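ERR on first pass: missing label on line 2. Operator R.T. fixed the label and resubmitted. Corrected input:
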Amino acid sequence: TFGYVHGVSGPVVTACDMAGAAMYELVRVGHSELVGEIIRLEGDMATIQVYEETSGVSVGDPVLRTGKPLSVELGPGIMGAIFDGIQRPLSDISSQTQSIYIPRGVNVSALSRDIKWEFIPSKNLRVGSHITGGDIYGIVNENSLIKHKIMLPPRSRGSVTYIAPPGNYDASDVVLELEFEGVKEKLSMVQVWPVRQVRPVTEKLPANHPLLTGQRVLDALFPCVQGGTTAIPGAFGCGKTVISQSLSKYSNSDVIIYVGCGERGNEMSEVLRDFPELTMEVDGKVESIMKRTALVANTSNMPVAAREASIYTGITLSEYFRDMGYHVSMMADSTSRWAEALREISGRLAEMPADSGYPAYLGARLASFYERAGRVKCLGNPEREGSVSIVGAVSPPGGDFSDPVTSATLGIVQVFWGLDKKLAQRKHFPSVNWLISYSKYMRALDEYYDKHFTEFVPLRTKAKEILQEEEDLAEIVQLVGKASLAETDKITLEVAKLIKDDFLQQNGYTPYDRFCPFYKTVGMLSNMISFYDMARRAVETTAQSDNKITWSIIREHMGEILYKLSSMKFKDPVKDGEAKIKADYAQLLEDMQNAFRSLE
Amino acid sequence: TFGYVHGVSGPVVTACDMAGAAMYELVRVGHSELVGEIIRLEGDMATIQVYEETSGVSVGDPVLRTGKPLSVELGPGIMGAIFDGIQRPLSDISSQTQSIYIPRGVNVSALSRDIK
Amino acid sequence: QAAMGSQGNLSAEVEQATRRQVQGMQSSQQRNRERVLTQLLGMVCDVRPQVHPNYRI
Amino acid sequence: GGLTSEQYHSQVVGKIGYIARCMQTIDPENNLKKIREDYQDVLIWAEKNYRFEEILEASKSGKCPNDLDALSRRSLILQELLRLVSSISPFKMKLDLIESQYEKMKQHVNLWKSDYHVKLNQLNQLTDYLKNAAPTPKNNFLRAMTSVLQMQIAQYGITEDNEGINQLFKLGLHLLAMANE
Amino acid sequence: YLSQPRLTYKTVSGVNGPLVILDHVKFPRYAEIVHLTLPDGTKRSGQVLEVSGSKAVVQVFEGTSGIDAKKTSCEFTGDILRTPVSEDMLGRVFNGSGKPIDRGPVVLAEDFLDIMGQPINPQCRIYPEEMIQTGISAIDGMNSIARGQKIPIFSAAGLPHNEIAAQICRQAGLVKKENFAIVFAAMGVNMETARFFKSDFEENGSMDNVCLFLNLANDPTIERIITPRLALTTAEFLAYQCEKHVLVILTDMSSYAEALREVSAAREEVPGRRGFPGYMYTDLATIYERAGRVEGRNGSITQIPILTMPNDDITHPIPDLTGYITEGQIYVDRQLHNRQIYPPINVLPSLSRLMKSAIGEGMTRKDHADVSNQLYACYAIGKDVQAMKAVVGEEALTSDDLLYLEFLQKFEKNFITQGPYENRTVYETLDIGWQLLRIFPKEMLKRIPQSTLSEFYPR
Amino acid sequence: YLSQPRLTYKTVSGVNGPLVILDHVKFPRYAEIVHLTLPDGTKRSGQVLEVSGSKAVVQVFEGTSGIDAKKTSCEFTGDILRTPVSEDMLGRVFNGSGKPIDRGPVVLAEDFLDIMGQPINPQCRIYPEEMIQTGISAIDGMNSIARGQKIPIFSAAGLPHNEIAAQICRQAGLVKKENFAIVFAAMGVNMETARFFKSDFEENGSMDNVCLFLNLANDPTIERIITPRLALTTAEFLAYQCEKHVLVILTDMSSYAEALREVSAAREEVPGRRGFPGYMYTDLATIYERAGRVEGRNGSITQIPILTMPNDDITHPIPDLTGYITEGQIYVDRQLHNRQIYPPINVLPSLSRLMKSAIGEGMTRKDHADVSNQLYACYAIGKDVQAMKAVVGEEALTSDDLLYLEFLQKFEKNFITQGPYENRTVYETLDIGWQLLRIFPKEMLKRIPQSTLSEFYPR
Amino acid sequence: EKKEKQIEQQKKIQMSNLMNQARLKVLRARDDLITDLLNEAKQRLSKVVKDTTRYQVLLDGLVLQGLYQLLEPRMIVRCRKQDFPLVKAAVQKAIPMYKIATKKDVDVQIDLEAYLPEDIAGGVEIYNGDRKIKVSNTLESRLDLIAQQMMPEVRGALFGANANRKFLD
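pass 2 clean. output:
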C-alpha cells in the first residue's frame, strides 16, 4: 500500500518498498499527498515524476500507491471549466480554499458531484438490449451549445439491466446498469480514462473539410482541415498565441480545448475574460463560446512535470468530445514547454540525451501525441463522425527552426504555419511566413473548394505564383536596384505588396478584421488577382506600342482604385452584411474594369 | 585450456576463467567456435572482439583458447584467391558447402592442402 | 445499369472459386489428418529429459 | 480493423443489436418485408433471443456477420432510414415509398456525403429546435412550416428532387437562423 | 510552529564546488535550510538541493571555501527558506540575502513568507488593463505598460538601462487624466549602479517608500538566486496582503542567469543553449510570473527586469527566454546610444503584449492603437529605405522613400528622443505621433481606417 | 527442434524506458526472445540485448508501460527471433511485428527464418545489370536503377517522397529492348501515409503481390527495430527461395534510426554523432545489404529505402551512413518542391552507382551514358550561371550563360517535371533529353563523343 | 471520359476488395482446420492421461525434465489433485536420477496446498524454491511448444508442399 520516499532531487522522487508498483502508476507522495507517476522502477524502488512542487518533501514521507494510471474523469461539467494540468478544476479550488493560490496536494474532484444534470435516455434502449463501448445511452443538456451525449466507456459491454428514467441526476448517480459474463457493472454519467491510452475509434477517415480560421493567410494559402495536425513555429512575439486564440474564438469546430501548456499565466485570464463576452449565434440565439470552450492551464511557473499531464489531458478531453460526434479542436499553446519538461525530467533521471539535451524519445512522444488528431468514425452503435484537430504552437529557442522540437514537429505534422520575427517586428500580423509555410491538405481540400468556392483554387495558385515571383525579384532588386525591372515585373512587385499589406496581414484586434469570412477572403483575393490580370494585360498589349502603358501611368491614373483595394480589408462582416460586402467588391471590380478600359 | 562465456553484447563477448590469456590472442567462442580476439583483460576475465555474429551465444558457452594472435597463412595458393577479411577463402567455402551462405564459425584452411 | 451485372456475376464467380478451394484444402486435411496427429502426439509423449549443455560438474 | 480483437467483436455484436433495435423501432409491425429480408442474417440474432456472450462467441467463430465495414454500412443505411421515418413522425409514410427510399439509400456510394443525409440534417435542425422552442411567433411559424415540410416529405421522400421540399427547406432554415428579435 | 530542538550535524562527508554533501542526516528535507558554522566561527547558509536516504547535498550560498570535513557544523532549520516580511521593509536597504545593511534592526516580521511564493490560480488572476504613464514616449505611445505587467528592459553593457529604469520609477503613474511602492533588487551590479539607484530614490522623496536588495559584484554568486525571490516575496506581501501598488525592478537578470548556470554546472545538469541549464525557462518563469493583479485584492506587482544582452544578441538564451516568459521587452539600442539619443529605445523590436487592451477608447485616447501601428509601419519602411539608399544612393530614391526618410529622422528626433526628466502625457505623445504621420498623405497611412484619418489627420 | 520446457521468471529486477532487466536468469542467450505476461494478462515480447552472468536486458518491443517487478512473468523462448515466412505472406497487411492487422489468420509458417538473415557469400552474389525502368525520367535518364540495387530516396519533412515511391512501385519494370513483388516496411509513418500506400496498391489492383508491414506513428517505437528485418526476411524468402523479383520499400529509415537511438540511450552506450549509436553503420548495413542477386537463384531483391533528412541536412548521420552503404541516392529537393516541380528529384546530389553498367548499347541505347553525363554537366553549369545571375544581374551574362539558363529552365520544366501517373520509358526520357541538349551548339556538348553527336544530334 | 475511367477504376478497386476477401477467407479456413487438428490433439492427450500406466511413464519424464531445466537446490512441483499419487511416484523416482546425473543435492516438495486446475490435460509445473522461476510442463504447454515449431511440417503434410519454393536454403 505505502512506499516511503527515499530521495528527492526536484520533480523526481525515489521511493522505498514499492515492490510491485507498475510503470506509470499514479502515486501520492508526501503527507500533503502530491500526485506523481512512476517512470523508472529499479529493484524495489520506484522513481516518480511528482506533478506538484516537492520542496518540503522529506525522506520517510509516505508514497501511497493508487493502482491506476494518470486518468481523467470524462463527464458532464467540463465545458466552460478551467482545469489544472491533472484535471483539478481551478474554479472549484478557488471556491473551496477562498484563496488565490493552488494549495499543494489539493484533492478536489474533477467534475462536480452536486450539480443536477438533466438526463434523457436514448429512447431505443431497454432492459436486456445488447450494448457496447461507445454506444450512447442518453443525453445531458449540459448547456445551450453542447448536447453532451453520455456513452458507454470503451472496454465496457454487455446486456442492459437498468436504464434510468429521464430526469435530473447528479454525476455520482447510477444512470445505467449492464452485465457481461454474469459480472454486473453500474455506470454513472462519469467515466475515467487513462490519458496515455488512445481512445479507440472504429475507423480514421480522411480529413476532407477545412478548419476555417479567422485568418486570411491561413484559410487561403495554407489550409488546415478538421482532423488535421498543424504547427505554428515562431520566435517570441510572432503571434502564435494570438493565432491560436483567434482560431479558438472563431472557427467551425463544435468544441474547443485550449491546453495552456507552459505559457504565460495572464493569457488564461485573457481567455476567461474574452470568451464569456464573445458570443456565437445558434438557432437565432446568441450564446457565449465559453459554453463550447474548455481550458487546461499549466502556466510556466506551475510544476514542470505537470506540463506533460496538461498535454495528455487536453488531447483526451478532445478525444472524448470527438467520440460524441463533435469536431473538436485542441490548441497546445506550446509543445516546446512540454519538451523542456521531458528534458528536465530526463536530466533528473540522468538519461543519455538526444540533440540539445532532449531525451531520445522526444520524437516518439510528439508523434504519439499528434497522431490522435484524425477525423474518425466514432465507436459505438449510433454511427457518428467526429474530429480532433490539433494546433501545436512551437517556441523554438533563438527563433530558429533547426531546434530539435520544431524539427520533430515538422516531421510529424501536416500543416506548418511558420511565423517570422521580422514580420512580427514590422507588425505584419499574422506573422505567417508565406514562403516556408505549407499545408499538405491543399489537394484533399480541392474537392470542397471546387464546388463551394470554385474560383478560389486558381486564385490561390496565381497568388502563390505572384509571391514567389516577387521573392525571386527581391534579391535582384536589392543588389541591382529597381531600375532594371521590366514593366510586368513592376506590376508583380506592386501587386505582391498589395497582397502583403492588404490581404495577408490582418489585425486580429479590430472589429473589421478580427474575423474574415471565407467569402470575404476569396472575394478580396479575386479583386486583387483581377487587378493583377488586367494590369499585366494592359502592359503586355501596349509594350510594343509607341504609347506604352507603364506601372507609373497605372499608379497615377488609379490612385483611387489602389486605395480601394487597400481599404477592402476594412469591411466589417457584421456591421456590413455579406450582401453589402460582396456588392462592394463587385462594384470595385466594375470600377477597375471601367478605369482600365478608359485608360487603354 | 578454455574459458567460459560470461556475458555478451554485440560483438563484445566477455569470458571468465581466462586466467593466463594474452592480449589479441585468438579464442573460439560458442559451440560453433566463432573466432574471437582478446582485446582486453580484467583480473581473470577477458573481453573478446568476436569476428562473427554473436546472436545465439549464451552464458556458459565454452571459450576455447588458441595461443596465437590473429594470423594469416602465407604460401602457395594465394594468387587468384578471394579471401574474407580474416583469410577465409570464400570460393572454397562456396565449393565446400555447395551453398550461397557463409556458415557461422565455418573453419576451412586458408590455403588448400589438397593441391599438388 | 447494364454494368452492375459485372459485380452481379463476379461475386458469384469468386464465391464459387473460394468454395472449390475450401473443398480442396478440406479433402487434403482429411487425407493427412491422422498420420500428422500420430507424429505430433508421439513427439509430445517422447520426453527425453536433458540438462542444459553448459552445465558443469 | 484498427481495434483490439475483443473490442472488434464486441463492436460487431453491438452493431447487430443496434440493427435489431433500429428495425424494431422503424417497423414495430414487421411490415417492411424487403428490408427485413435484406437484414435477415443480422436480425436473426435478435428475433431469436441470444445472450451477449453467445452472440460474441458466434461473432468470434464467424457464424454471425462479423465484418465491421459491412455491418457499419448496413447499420448506417438503416439508421438514416429510421431518422427519416422518425423525423416525419406525425405523417407516417407509405410502405412503397419507404422501400423505395431504402433502395435509393442502399445504392448510394457513401451516405455521409449524400444529399439525402444533408436533407435529413436540415430536417433534424428544424425538428430539434422545435422540440424545445417556446411559442413565440417565430416558433409558431417554424412549427407550421415544419409540419408542412414533414407532410410533403411523407408524400415525396428526401431522395427525390422535389422543388417544394427544397424551397421549404431553404426558407425554414432561413427562418431558424434569423435572429429572434 | 516548530517546537523541536534542531539537529546540528558535524557529519560532513564531501565538499565539491558550492556543495557540502552531508551524511547521516535524519529524515532530511529537500529544500530545507542549513546554517553552517565553519571551523573559524564564520556562519553561512545553504539550501538542501537533494536528499537520498541519509545524505543531503547542501548548496551553500556564500561558497564552500574554508569548509572542513570533520569540523564544519551544520544545524538543520527544519523548514524551507522563509523570509520575514513586514511593511516596515519600505525605506530599508537589505543585502542579497535579506540582511539589513543600513544599520537598522533586522526585520521584525509581520509574517514568514515562503521565498518561492506560490503561483496565482490562473482562474482568479485579473488581467492588467490599467495603463502606467511612464512619461517615456517610446513606451507610452508604442509599448504602453499595464499595471501588473512583466515588461523587462532588454539592454547591453554600458547602455542607459539604469537611467531608463530610474526615469520610469520617478514618473510612472496611471493615465487617469496613487504612488508606487518600489521594490528594487540588484544582482551582481557595480557599486556605481547601486549608488546611482539609491541616490536617485533619495534625490526624489521616494526613499521613504522604497525597498532595496543589493547583491554587488563582489557579493556571493549563489545568493543572487535568492535575491530576486526575496524581493518578489516582499512585493507579494505588499501587493496581495497590504494592497500596495508595487513596482519591482530586478537588475541584471543576466548576472542572475549566470549564477544559475554556475549552480547547474556544479550539479552537472543537462545544459540548454550556450551552457545554461535546461530548466532556465522554468526558473525565470518562477521569477517573472510573480506579477499582475488578483481577484478581490486591490494591489498589483509591475515588474521591469533589466538584463544585459551579451554581445547585444537578442537570441542569447537569457534575453530569448525572458522574451518568451515576459509580456514584452523594451529594447535599448547601441546604434541609438552611439548617436546620443536618449532614451535609445528601439521601438521596432520593442513590444508590449498588454497594450492591446491598455489602450483604446475610454482609457487614454481612441487613436492610440492606430497611431502606434502606423508609426511602427512607417519606421520599418524608413529603415528599409535607409538600408537601400546605402546600396543605390540618394539619386535613385523616389519621393515616397524621401517621405519615409524624413519621417524616420523626425521620429527619432521628436518622438523617441526625450529629456531624462521630461514626463510626456500619453496625449502629448500621441499628438507628436500625429504631427509625424502628417508627413504622409492619407493614402500612404494604410493602417489607419478612414474613420480615424478624417477625424484626427486634418488638425 | 526445441523440446525442453521454457523457463518463466517473475524475477524482473528493473524497468527503464524500453528495457526490462532480469536477474537470476539460467544460462541467458544473447538475442533471445522473451514473452512477457504483464500483471493484467497483456502479453508483450522482447529481445535480450545483452547478458552478464545471470542478468539479461530484455528490450521490450511493445513498450514497458504497465510492467512491474514481482509480477511481470518473462518466458524465455530459448531461441533467437525466427519469423514465420510463407509465400502467402503476399497480399497481407501485418503490423510492425509481423502480426496480422487485416483480420486474416496468423501466418502458417511455410518455414521459420532467423530475422537477422544469413550472410550471402560475396563470391556468389551476381552483379546486377538489368535496368529497372522506374518510368520517372529523372531516375531512368540520369540515375538508372539496376534490378538488385539499393537506392534510397533521400527526402525531408513535407516532400512527396511517398508519391515518388508509390509511382516507382506501380511503374517499375524491366526495359523492353517479370513482374515485381512489393514488400513494404512502413515505420513511423502517419496514418495518412499508411492509408495512402495501402489505397494506392489497392487502386492499381496490385495487392495480390504486395506485403505490408505497417508500424504506424502511434505504434510502439521499439517495434520498428524488427519491422525492417521482418520485411527483408520475407523478401529474401520470396526471392532466394520462391524465385520472385522482390522490390522492398522501407518507409522511414530516420524513424528506424530514432528507434535505435532510443534503445542506445536507454542502454547508456557511448554515443556517436548526434546521439546515435556508434554501431549505426553496421546496423544499417545489416538492413541495406540484403538486396541483390545470387547465383543459381533467378529471384532478386531491389531495395528503395526512404530517408527524412533532419533539417534537410544530408550530412546528418542517418543519410550520411546510408549513403556510405547503399549504391547511390535519389535526392528530393525542397526548392524544386516549393517551385512546384514534381518529382522534385535534384539530379546534382543524386547518383546511381550501377547506372554505368546498367546502361549502354544493347541494354537501353548507345547514347544513354553520354546524354546523362552531358545533361548533368549542363545542369551544373546552369546552376552556377543562375547563382551568378542572382548576384550580378542578367546583363553580365554572355550568350553561353543565357543558353545555360534556358537549358536549366526547360530541363526542370520538361525533363524533371513529370506527371505522377506518367511513365516515360527510357527512350522517351532520352529523346526529351536530346531535345534539351539541342539548345546548345555541338561545340559546347563536350562530354558527348562526335561519333554519337553526328548520329543523334541532328534529328 | 474521366467519369468512365473513374468507374473502371471503381471496378478495379472493388474487384481487388473481393479478391482480398476470397484470399483471406480461404486462409482463415485453412487456419481453422489447423486449429481443429490441434484441438483433436488436445483431446487425444486428455485421453492418454486416462491410461494411468503410460501417464505414469510420461509424468516421470516431465518431472525429471523440469528438475533438469531448473537445477535448483529446492523445488516445488505443482500438479492436479487428481494426479497427486502419480506425481509423488514421479518425484520419488526422479530424485535419484537427478542426483546421479547432476551430482547436486535436491529437495523436491509437492504443492499439496495449491493444485493445478482440474481442467488441465495433465503434467506438472515446477517452481524454484522461492517461486520466482517456473518451468511449465503441462501437456498443453508441451503440445503448444511442439506444434508451433512443427507448423511447417503440419502445413506441408496436410496441404502439400509449395510448388514455387524451388530451394530450401
